[PDB]
């Protein structure tokens, strides 16, 4: 289930690995654009459902009434979306999704406002009174299967990107040949063979007489691998 419009939750994502390449590459997405970044490289994710016209109007640098009224964006990161018509549209109308018609002031970049506070709309002090020349600021749209592209609901995520690591690529270990290697952060060239030494559990690399890094624990199957130079 998605945050309803004006019931937004920008989730902080950190201290984990994530694969943006996979999220990006899937054929299920309706749209995808990045701002100074690229998903092929692999932090917040605000996940919600809005109408197609708003999907198109709420984006970094995009001017429009609704962006200024909902979630104003300038940012470094990506905006991704996928049509949710078969999740959110209901027969008779899904009216749980409010849109803002009237507002006191505009939003600052990468700022959102979920308030329902009554606005005088430049004229009348409603103070709980029905909106006669003053208004309840929001009005919902009945998402129904029978609707156009700008009205279909889409699930939209604003992905800010730092605190999240991409996956690492490993290849098969090759032994008894001269290999150009990279173990975690250790690089060099030599022949990789089994070692007869053992390391304490937290030690990852070992040293020769002048501190050349030589022995290493294999990152997937910790064992001591012997690194000796080629002739």
């Amino acid at each position: 289930r998605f945050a309803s419009v004006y019931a937004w939750n920008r989730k902080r994502i950190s201290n984990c690995v994530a694969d943006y390449s996979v999220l990006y590459n899937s054929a299920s997405f309706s749209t995808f654009k990045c701002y100074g970044v690229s998903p092929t490289k692999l932090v917040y994710a605000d996940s919600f459902v809005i109408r197609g016209d708003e999907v198109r109007q709420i984006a970094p640098g995009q001017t429009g009434k609704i962006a200024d009224y909902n979630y104003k964006l300038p940012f470094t990161g990506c905006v991704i979306a996928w049509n949710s018509n078969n999740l959110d549209s209901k027969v008779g109308g899904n009216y749980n999704y409010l849109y803002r018609l009237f507002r006191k002031s505009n939003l600052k970049p990468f700022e959102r406002d979920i308030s329902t506070e009554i606005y005088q709309a430049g004229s009348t002090p409603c103070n709980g009174v029905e909106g006669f020349n003053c208004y309840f600021p929001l009005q919902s749209y009945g998402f129904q299967p029978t609707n156009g592209v700008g009205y279909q609901p889409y699930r939209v995520v604003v992905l800010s990107f730092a605190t999240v690591c991409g996956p690492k690529k490993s290849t098969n270990l090759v032994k008894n040949k001269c290999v150009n290697f990279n173990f975690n952060g250790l690089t060099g060239t030599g022949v990789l063979t089994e070692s007869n030494k053992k390391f304490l559990p937290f030690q990852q690399f070992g040293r020769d007489i002048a501190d050349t890094t030589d022995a290493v624990r294999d990152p997937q199957t910790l064992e001591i691998l012997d690194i000796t130079p080629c002739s």
């Epitope: 109308g93 006669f132 309840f136 009005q139 919902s140």
Partner: antibody, heavy 124, light 107 residues
Framework: QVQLVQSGAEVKKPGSSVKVSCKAS????????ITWVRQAPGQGLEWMGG????????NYAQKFQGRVTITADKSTSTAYMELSSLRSEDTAVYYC??????????????????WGQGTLVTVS | DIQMTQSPSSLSASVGDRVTITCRAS??????LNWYQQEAGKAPKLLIY???SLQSGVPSRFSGSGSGTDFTLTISSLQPEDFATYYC?????????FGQGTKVDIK
């Protein structure tokens, strides 16, 4: 859109309380005020008060201060009103209405488009 | 609130005839003056939406407009539901005020 359907008639005497609530149908319940209107024996209507479930504070008629308490719960889909300070002159049919809104851009209209059938209170 | 006056209280007409009902406000509002059609024990419908159209879904049997605080609306062919009491409401403020109520009267 929501045609609010009420409780049955009260057969109590003047000064007693009235328990009336309406069950929602349609859709679009949490937004726009749930209001109540009184129907006089014979003719004449008066607004008593109402509430938007989203805001939760309501607004009431001065004519009904001490008589009308109105609430609503968007999580229940039920409209509620309780009557007190009841007198024999308050014999009436008590109705649910929705304050349904349409917006002509800048200017909006809030109307009792949906209605209930009305709960009769026979105190007379 | 705005005081509403609605008249004639009793109209002489029968089904299929032309019936004119008027309502006047104490305040100069052009579109929040609208009428409802109510029978006791039945849910009422709003007849007029924002002065210019019909809320109830009526195919323009009724038509009207106002000037100043004076609103007039007429039906070209009177129907059985027009014997319901028409109530003129001014939605603009609170408590909402309704007029006395009018209808076609057959004895």
């Amino acid at each position: 859109q929501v045609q609010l359907v009420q409780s049955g008639a009260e057969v109590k005497k003047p000064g007693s309380s009235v328990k009336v609530s309406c069950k929602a149908s349609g859709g679009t319940f949490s937004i726009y005020a749930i209001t109540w209107v009184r129907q006089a024996p014979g003719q004449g209507l008066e607004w008593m008060g109402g509430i938007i479930p989203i805001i939760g504070t309501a607004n009431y008629a001065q004519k009904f201060q001490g008589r009308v308490t109105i609430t609503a719960d968007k999580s229940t889909s039920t409209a509620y009103m309780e009557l007190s300070s009841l007198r024999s002159e308050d014999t009436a049919v008590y109705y649910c209405a929705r304050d349904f809104r349409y917006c002509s851009s800048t200017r909006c209209y809030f109307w009792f488009d949906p209605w209930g059938q009305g709960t009769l209170v026979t105190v007379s | 609130d705005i005081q509403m006056t609605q008249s004639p209280s009793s109209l002489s007409a029968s089904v299929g005839d032309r019936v004119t009902i008027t309502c006047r406000a104490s305040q100069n509002i052009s579109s929040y003056l609208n009428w409802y059609q109510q029978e006791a024990g039945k849910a009422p419908k709003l007849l007029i939406y924002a002065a210019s159209s019909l809320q109830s879904g009526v195919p323009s049997r009724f038509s009207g407009s106002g000037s100043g605080t004076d609103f007039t609306l007429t039906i070209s062919s009177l129907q059985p539901e027009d014997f319901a009491t028409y109530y003129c409401q001014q939605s603009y403020s609170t408590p909402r005020t309704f007029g006395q109520g009018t209808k076609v009267d057959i004895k």
